Design a binder for this molecule. Structure first.
Ligand SMILES: C[Se@@+](CC[C@H](N)C(=O)O)C[C@H]1O[C@@H](n2cnc3c(N)ncnc32)[C@H](O)[C@@H]1O
Length: 184
């Protein structure tokens, strides 16, 4: 049974190409009208923090829910750093490769729907993750190209990250991947 997913969306991009709108349209998640309306004590996905999501976070997702902010990647750092404090259990995703047509093959920077599916998979909701990904023709391939990493991540093993990113200093590497989008 899929955990309850809640999304606050910054209405910036055109919604016909936004993956969060599609999640909501099919009932995998529900939109809320503000960040304050997101459930307190829930897991919130947050690419700006250094603490990776682990399988044991499942217990929180089941009981409080899973929250996300949908915005442009150009605004993502500013939004997450300035508007969510204390209210949530903030977790980045472990390092994964994007499968969407825009950023295919590139690390860490995922679409909202890929992030939701990754979170679900890691927390043991593999069937739900696939149901979500099947909303796009390229969706299931996200698990395929990340299969070896996801298997370790779902088993609580984060050792793939340094080899995949190719740096010991993962923190700096992640900060730079996002800096590229912030400044471009
Ligand atoms: C900035 Se949003 C851009 C949406 C895109 N135009 C689309 O239509 O799907 C992607 C959101 O997905 C989650 N997310 C993505 N990657 C990660 C990550 N690596 N760690 C943690 N969370 C991640 C964050 O909630 C993001 O805010």
């Amino acid at each position: 049974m899929i955990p309850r997913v809640f999304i606050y969306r910054l209405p910036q991009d055109d919604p016909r190409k936004n993956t969060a709108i599609k999640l909501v349209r099919f009932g995998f998640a529900q939109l809320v009208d503000s960040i304050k309306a997101l459930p307190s004590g829930s897991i919130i996905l947050d690419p700006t923090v250094k603490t990776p999501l682990t399988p044991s976070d499942r217990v929180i997702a089941e009981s409080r829910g899973l929250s996300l902010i949908d915005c442009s990647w150009k605004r993502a750092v500013d939004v997450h750093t300035k508007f969510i404090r204390g209210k949530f259990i903030r977790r980045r995703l472990p390092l994964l490769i994007a499968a969407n047509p825009t950023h295919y093959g590139k690390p860490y920077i995922l679409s909202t729907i890929e992030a939701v599916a990754a979170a679900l998979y890691i927390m043991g909701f593999k069937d739900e993750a696939m149901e979500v990904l099947r909303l796009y023709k390229w969706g299931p391939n996200f698990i395929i190209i990340n299969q070896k990493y996801l298997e370790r991540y779902a088993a609580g093993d984060l050792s793939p990250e340094r080899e995949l990113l190719g740096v010991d200093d993962v923190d700096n590497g992640l900060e730079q991947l996002m800096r590229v989008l912030t400044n471009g």
